Structure formats: structure tokens, C-alpha cells
Design a protein around this ligand. Structure first.
Ligand SMILES: [Cl-]
Ligand SMILES: [Cl-]
Ligand SMILES: [Cl-]
Ligand SMILES: [Cl-]
Lengths: 472, 470
């Protein structure tokens, strides 16, 4: 039910899953028939990534060890044994060419130039936005692949750090991730002995000889450094390992070839996890939330408002928060404020970080459904109108209050960090970039207000969402 | 027990051993009583190294995992440690106010030998040169406890390598295992880390990352282990990575044991050399007595040094001593070719095309009929090399003969396991001449002294007379 319960279930399924690089001439039935001899298979799919790969989700974890028991070491290699397998035929020239294999599950979304025609063939702006959402959103197969990537990194980390867990956060889990997005991973340490340890009969407290480091930051940097070097030199399918240990949140970036994901590994950050669960709640509350976010992120990218590299540009996160604020301010609100979510929280949902109460309700059924019935056609235009006429000089965005309030500090765009006091999430944004955003918003509002959609359809020209998803 | 069988047994015992940093107020009985609840303990001892530490050797390996299952990270330590779990434990009292046993002193096992200034008086009170040399040997040689500690150090380093090379081994060589090591000597360690089912309709293999060329692989693996030694455990390690040397090397101080260590990738020739020396050391007690005394002599007179350079090495010196013993009438030890001829098929070892075989079973070697005393052998060693023609002759330990020098080098000692290689190529003419001068002077001192009067006069005599600066 809850965000935490979804993560637990996803990780358990990943724990009994494996990846297989398939033979050039793949017979699906023969492969599955063989794998089923090691135990029942709950789920599986194929994907393309420099050849065909299969994700296999066994019903029982024991099946993994069963398969590993008949798997050999190639024959010079780093003999780290994993859940990455390569299957080939003994006598490849004695099997014929295969007629109709296999269904491929896409791990990327269609490019904008292919999307636009689909949008133009839609009946309304609402339908356009749902088409975009369906084309872009993470698939069940992609999600399974993301959790398996985390599970594999966990196993790699567990060689030196047996209590390691690796769990995804951000776009991979908050409902706003699009196909192709990075897998952001958090490493944490928790006792694998989940069972109830007795009262020991002896007199001693017993610990490992470990250096007590002055800061959590230094420990984090040393741990990530070793894991990074090990992935680089010893880990199968890990490439382009970049150590970015001196960043605000120390980080190791890498490309995971078996899955084709770009990944980012850091040590667990409690604030970042609260943020992911908050966005998950908002995304789950109403489908218009996700529809708006996906369309507006695409809009921002198309018009050069967002960028892949950090700088003076508004970030996708900042933009997403602006959208949440917009939705909080509808009459009636489409989503509750963070203070409203805090007040619905019981003792079990108490989360205090750095002295600041970051509590909010985890049970979605405790949130009264919105009575707002505005269509996406209205909301898209109104978003552009609202921020196109928003006084950014005088007002800041407070998502806890759901109100425009005086700016604590002078900054072009001030959006309050909802889990840290006196922090602006959009402090990076300069006046030029903010003015560009405003100009694009106003132009987009005008285009939607003035267009004759029926004639554009007849004239075979872009209309509605498509009209604002092309350069001006 | 062959050399190989000794190593195997030692490593197996180290594999089921742990190190425990003991409570400030240590009750030995309570500690052992508690630890025995995880399984029987075959051996244990205590040593001093910034507080009391205990080596615990469990009867069963399973006991290690049992102890680890109740070992925890403090709440205050969370997020502030590198969570590498090891066989290094710290024990403290749950309630410091719950001591309810009589306090007894704990026996400390020494890991160092007495300094020369304390040794000399003991030598001067001996009855003969032979007795002096056996006193030195007994004061200096590795103890059973020290040996266990050395193998455990290797075992701990092995566990770092095994994270991604599960079949890895780390084994000591050189002075730690060849019978000629003295307390306080480095632990020289070799890593061997790579190249060590039902049939379905698919061939099935793991996806594994390729290693680079042997040297590059060696450099990367040693670099990571060096980083582990830095960051895993209590640390304070003084890790020196010397990865660009001819033989890539990591030097470090292992704080839990207090050993100075050198880690490199396994060299098959160096291992044969260690077993050869082990054979020679085991054959006759005079072999070890001579080597220990002469190594001490070399150090005292500045002929050997802790850092590599133009100095004769302890290994080269030891080989010179072996050559000397091969040349006695009759020989005290056999030549390497004699040991080769005694080898059966099971003792076959060919390295780089060169037959490095020799007998491993010591009972197959006929005991020496030489009955020369150490008094004679010590003086004769100095006399022999003091008059040896180093310009014209080289030392061949396979033949047990002086032979023409293959290449021009001040001191030429044939590498017994590699063709056309001089183990003492590093030695320059100045250092060789110093050695010769010291040898000749030492011979004269022993030849001319009146030992009875020196004893009465309370002056150094015999071995003591050559173990002080000239
Ligand atoms: Cl194949
Ligand atoms: Cl997030
Ligand atoms: Cl996008
Ligand atoms: Cl040796």
C-alpha cells in the first residue's frame, strides 16, 4: 500500500531475479523450458541492448542458487560471481535460423518528432497529454529492470559491506520518471540479522575494530571511493565510473551495460527520501498531476529552459515543485499542502530530520479525494497564464502553506525547500533564465488562447499541446 | 611434515583464528569461558601492542561466524565508520561496575628480541663460542606465538583480496617461513589471486570483467588492497604503494599485529628459494646457529641495511653461508643438484623451462658425517670469504663449486633457479671490499684472542668480540 511497502515488495522480487544474455539464435520456449527446470518463473521479458537480454523473475529465491550451481567461469577474468549470465549454444551451426522470436520490451520513449504526429491526431488537449504520459512513463518491465540494477549493485557492495542495501530514489520511484532517466541509488547499512537476537549470557559488549571517523561525510567519501574503484576494475558490465566525492552529496556515476542504465550511487540521504515519497503521494492522488508534470517537463526541454548539465537553468525538480504549487492553488485545490499532509500524520508517520519535522501521512486513503474537476485543457493553459503573470520579484513559493509569501532572501526565483529551513531549491536560477521561462509561458498561453484547433487539424498543422511542444 | 604441508596446516589454523582487543580490566578466565561458548579453542595467547590483544585459535572454523553473529556496531558509530566486517574484534565490559572476580596478571608473549647491548653480557657469560651462538639463536628465533601471528596477518590480508577474487591466497615467504627469521623481521607476503556440473542444451557462463595484462592486473589488485588496509579496520597503516617497481609492492604497518609487511604477487622462484632454505635450516642445527650469528654480525658492522641499495642483502649473505657449508669436508649440507637427483616425480617443479625440482622429504637426505664445532665454523667462514677471489670466482650452489663469472659484477652468486642471473648484482665494489675487510678483521680477532683472560678481564670475547664495532 504505502511507498515503503512498494519498495520492499519491488526489492524482494529483484532479489530473486537474474539477467541472461541470450544466444544469437534465440528460441524463447526452449530457454524458458530449461530455466523452469530450476524452478517456477513468475515474470520474464526480453529487451534489446547490444543483443537480446532476458530478465527472469523466479518464484523462489532458491532457484537463483540452482542456476548458479550449473554456471561456469569463462575460460582471464575477475571471478566475481553474480546474477548476470551468458547463454550460448554448444553447436551453433547445428540449429536452424529462428522464425518469430522475440517480443522486445522498449526501455526508451519515442522521440518528439514521432510524438508530435500522434498528438496532432488526438481529439483534445487532455488526450494529447495522456498520450504523452503513456509514451513517456516508466513501464512495469523498466521498473523491474531498475530494481534489479539496484539489487546487483547491492550484491557487489555486500562483498566488503555485508549489511549493505541499495534502494532507488527520485524519478525511478516518485511516479514522474520517464523512460531513459538515470537510476538514482542510495546505499545504506542495516543488520542482515533480522531475527530477534537474545540477551547474551557473557559480560562483554562486542564490536569490530573500526576507525571512528570525525564526520559522516568522510566515511561516505571513503566507502564510495572503494566501491567506485571496485566497480571500475572488478564489476561486470560497469563502465565510465566517475567519482564525484566532493559534491554536496558525494556521488559515484556509472554506466551499467547489462541494463543500459546510467546510474548514480550515493549514501542514503533522509531528506531526499522524504522528497521522493512526497512526490509519490502527489503523483498517486490524481492522474492530472502526472499528466501535467510530464507535458510541462517536455515543454521546458523543447524550449531550452531545462538542460542536462547543472547551471543557471531551472531544474526539473524546481519545475515539478512549481507545478505542485500551482495545483495546491486551484479552487478547490487538486492536491493538499504539505502542512495538511503533516497534520494527517499519526505517530507512526513521525519523521524529524535535523530538528525539523518532516512528517506526513503515508496512507493515501486518509487523504480526502479532491472535488476539483477541471479538465487538463484548462489546467495547461492556466499554468502558463498563472506563472506568466506571477510576481517573482515580490513573491516566493511555499508548498507547506500553499501560499505566495515574502521572499526570505533576495533571489530571482525563490521556492521554499519543504524539508529544510531557510533553503531555496531554485537559488541557482538567474534573472535571464527566469525571464526566458516567463516569456515562454506567456507565448504558450497566447498560442493556446488564440488558436483555432478545428482548422489546424484540417490544415494538418500543430495544435494544442503539439503547438507548444515545437520551437517558437 | 614437508614445507608445503607445514604451510597448509599453518594457514588452516590462521583461517579459524581471530584477534581481540581486550578490556582495560582483563579477566582471562571470563574471556575464554565466554569465547568457548562459540566453540572449543585449540590455542590462544596475549601480546602487548598499544594495550592487550589476544590471538584466539578456534578448533572449528564455524566458531568465527558464531562470534561475528553477536558482534555489533555501536549506535554512536553508525554513519561514522567503514562497515567492513573482519576477524578483528574489540571487547569491552557491558557493565564496568560488574567485575566480580579476582584480578590475575596476564602472561604477555614477546614479539621482539632483546637488543644487542643486552645480548652481549649474556654472550660474555657463556662457556664457549658454540654456546654463545646457540644463546643468540634462542633469543632471536621466531616463537610459536609469533609464527601464528604472522600467518594470521596473512589470513587477514587474504580476506581483503577475496571480496572479488574468492580463490585468493596470501602466504608468507622468506624469513617468516624459511627457519632463518628473527623476531621483529618483516612479514613478506605473496598474493595469488587469479587462474587458480550438469550439462543442459545451453552453455552457461557468468558475465565477468576481463583483467588487463599480468603487470597491470597486479598493480590494480595491490592498489585496492592497499586502500583496504588504509580504510578497513583500525587503520593507522603507513601504506606505501610501490606499484611501479620491477616487482610491484605494497608496504604497510599492520597495527593489530604490529608487523611491518610487504605484499606482492606470487613469485614461483622466490617460493622455491624459501623451501630450499627451510630444508637446509632443518637438516642441522649448526646451519641456523651460523646464519643467525652472521646476520647479526653483518648488521652490527653496517654490511646489511633495512632499505635496498648497494649493500649485500640478508638473502645473498645467507646463500654465501649455504655455499660455505656445501664446501666443508665432508659437506654439512648437500648441493642443490644432489637435492634435485633425490626428487621423485611428485617433487617435479619446472619454472620457465628450468628444472627447479628438489626432494621435499627430509628423511630421504642422508645425515652429514661432518662433526666440526661452531667454534671452528665461525672462524673458518671469516677466513674463507676473507681470502676468496671475488674478482675471478662466482658462487654456484647447484654444483657446490667456485666457477668462472658469467658476467662482470663485483659479487656473483648464481641464482639456483634461473639461468644467467646474479642474485647479488646490486652489490658494488666498495660494499664488497667492506665485507671482505670485516671478515678478515673478524678472523684475526678470533684467531689471536685469549678467551680465558678476556673472561677474567670482563671484556668481550668469541662471538661477542665480533658483534661490536671495530
Ligand atoms: Cl550462441
Ligand atoms: Cl524526488
Ligand atoms: Cl521530457
Ligand atoms: Cl627465502
Amino acid at each position: 500500500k504505502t511507498f515503503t511497502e512498494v519498495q520492499t515488495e519491488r526489492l524482494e522480487q529483484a532479489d530473486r531475479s537474474v539477467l541472461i544474455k541470450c544466444p544469437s539464435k534465440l528460441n524463447e520456449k526452449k530457454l524458458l523450458q530449461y530455466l523452469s527446470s530450476h524452478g517456477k518463473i513468475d515474470n520474464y521479458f526480453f529487451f534489446e541492448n547490444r543483443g537480446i537480454h532476458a530478465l527472469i523473475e523466479f518464484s523462489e529465491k532458491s532457484s537463483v542458487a540452482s542456476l548458479q550451481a550449473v554456471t561456469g567461469i569463462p575460460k582471464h577474468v575477475v571471478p566475481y560471481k553474480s546474477r548476470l549470465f551468458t547463454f550460448t549454444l554448444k553447436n551453433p551451426g547445428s540449429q536452424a535460423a529462428e522464425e518469430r522470436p522475440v517480443k522486445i520490451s522498449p526501455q526508451s520513449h519515442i522521440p518528439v518528432n514521432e510524438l508530435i504526429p500522434k498528438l496532432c491526431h488526438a481529439d483534445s488537449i487532455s488526450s494529447q497529454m495522456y498520450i504523452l504520459l503513456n509514451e513517456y512513463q516508466l513501464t512495469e518491465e523498466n521498473i523491474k529492470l531498475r530494481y534489479l540494477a539496484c539489487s546487483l549493485v547491492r550484491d557487489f557492495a555486500r562483498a566488503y559491506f555485508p549489511d549493505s542495501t541499495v534502494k532507488p530514489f527520485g524519478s525511478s520511484v516518485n511516479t514522474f520518471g520517464k523512460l531513459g532517466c538515470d537510476v538514482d541509488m542510495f546505499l545504506d547499512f542495516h543488520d542482515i540479522q533480522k531475527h530477534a537476537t537474545k540477551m547474551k549470557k557473557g559480560p562483554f559488549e562486542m564490536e569490530y575494530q573500526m576507525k571512528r571517523l570525525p564526520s559522516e561525510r568522510l566515511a561516505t567519501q571513503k566507502i564510495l571511493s572503494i566501491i567506485g574503484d571496485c566497480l571500475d576494475n572488478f564489476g561486470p558490465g560497469y563502465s565510465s565510473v566517475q567519482k564525484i566525492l566532493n559534491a554536496r552529496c558525494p556521488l559515484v556515476k556509472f554506466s551499467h551495460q547489462p541494463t543500459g542504465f546510467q546510474c548514480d550511487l550515493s549514501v542514503s540521504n533522509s531528506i531526499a527520501i522524504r522528497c521522493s515519497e512526497l512526490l509519490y503521494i502527489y503523483g498517486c492522488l490524481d492522474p492530472r498531476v502526472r499528466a501535467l508534470v510530464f507535458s510541462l517537463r517536455c515543454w521546458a526541454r523543447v524550449h531550452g529552459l531545462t538542460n542536462s548539465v547543472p547551471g543557471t537553468w531551472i531544474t526539473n525538480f524546481s519545475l515539478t515543485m512549481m507545478i505542485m504549487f500551482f495545483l495546491q492553488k486551484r479552487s478547490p485545490p487538486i492536491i493538499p499542502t504539505l502542512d495538511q499532509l503533516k497534520e494527517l500524520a499519526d505517530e507512526k508517520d513521525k519523521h524529524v530530520i535535523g530538528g525539523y519535522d518532516c512528517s506526513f501521512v503515508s496512507d493515501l486513503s486518509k487523504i480526502k479525494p479532491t472535488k476539483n474537476t477541471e479538465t487538463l485543457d484548462e489546467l495547461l493553459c492556466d499554468f502558463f497564464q498563472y506563472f506568466g503573470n506571477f510576481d517573482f520579484r515580490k513573491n516566493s513559493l511555499n508548498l507547506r502553506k500553499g501560499k505566495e509569501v515574502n521572499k526570505p532572501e533576495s533571489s530571482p526565483l525563490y521556492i521554499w525547500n519543504p524539508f529544510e529551513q531557510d533553503l531555496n531549491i531554485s537559488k541557482n536560477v538567474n534573472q535571464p533564465q527566469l525571464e526566458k521561462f516567463v516569456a515562454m509561458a506567456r507565448e504558450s498561453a497566447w498560442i493556446l488562447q488564440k488558436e483555432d484547433k478545428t482548422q489546424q487539424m484540417i490544415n494538418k498543422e500543430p495544435w494544442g499541446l503539439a503547438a507548444v511542444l515545437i520551437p517558437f
